[PDB]
Design a protein around this ligand. Sequence first.
Ligand SMILES: [Zn+2]
Ligand SMILES: [Zn+2]
Lengths: 153, 157
Amino acid sequence: QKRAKSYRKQLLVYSHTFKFREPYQVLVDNQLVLECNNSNFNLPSGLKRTLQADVKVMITQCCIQALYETRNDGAINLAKQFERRRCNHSKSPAECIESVVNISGANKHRYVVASQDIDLRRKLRTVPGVPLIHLTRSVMVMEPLSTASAKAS
Amino acid sequence: QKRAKSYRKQLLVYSHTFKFREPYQVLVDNQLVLECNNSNFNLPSGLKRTLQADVKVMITQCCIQALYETRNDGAINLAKQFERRRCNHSFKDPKSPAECIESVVNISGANKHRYVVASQDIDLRRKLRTVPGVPLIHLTRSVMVMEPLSTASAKAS
Ligand SMILES: [Zn+2]
Ligand SMILES: [Zn+2]
């Protein structure tokens, strides 16, 4: 809800200064796919939620090939529901996405990229107008000390 | 470690004033188990890490019976690997998981058995902070996020 607010403001600039229009085109990388699979995160609905608009969710042939090699039969089937972006390659998932998104330092095709590869994200921020999405992992927390615990000192 | 550091200082009072000792006696409720199965989060490893010591992971019979009813075989089997905490709760004295844990942790106003409670039930958590000296643990939901606008984006505005 609260984030939907901050995001609403961010999307605006992609639409105005960058000419982005529904449905957003989102390249999903292999790591994100694995991740969402073995933690049961609905990747499709997750993107429509955060982008707050129709999204076309896609995966490059290099990313899905890499998935193929994991023989992680569960990730694979998921990737397949997505629309394939036919890259003209032969590379690593990372470089694939980079060369597809980064055309002469411009996001010519107005992709958004959802990746768990913080290395790929860093080098995409360089390119102006590239929305970046990722999944924050689950963590185990201990509540701060209660006041009743406090008063026993 | 930002946490490991913080948690270290918190455990100090539980051991100092409340006499908590490795291995920690942790009650794990049915919601937490369920969500750790669906997230593939290693519950026993998580607890061992956050408490910074070996732990005996237990679940009351009331909590596991609730799991049985969900007919979620993965969570059920996860629970089955835990030490069972026998309560004397029945068709005679029936209790929900929350009421079960509370009756077993809150003894005349004191955590007599020095349980730590790991639970996704905020209401149970709130009722337990009442009792002095009960460590509380829970899982955050993994969330999808969009990075904040990049400088390269802002500059071109
Ligand atoms: Zn490619
Ligand atoms: Zn019980």
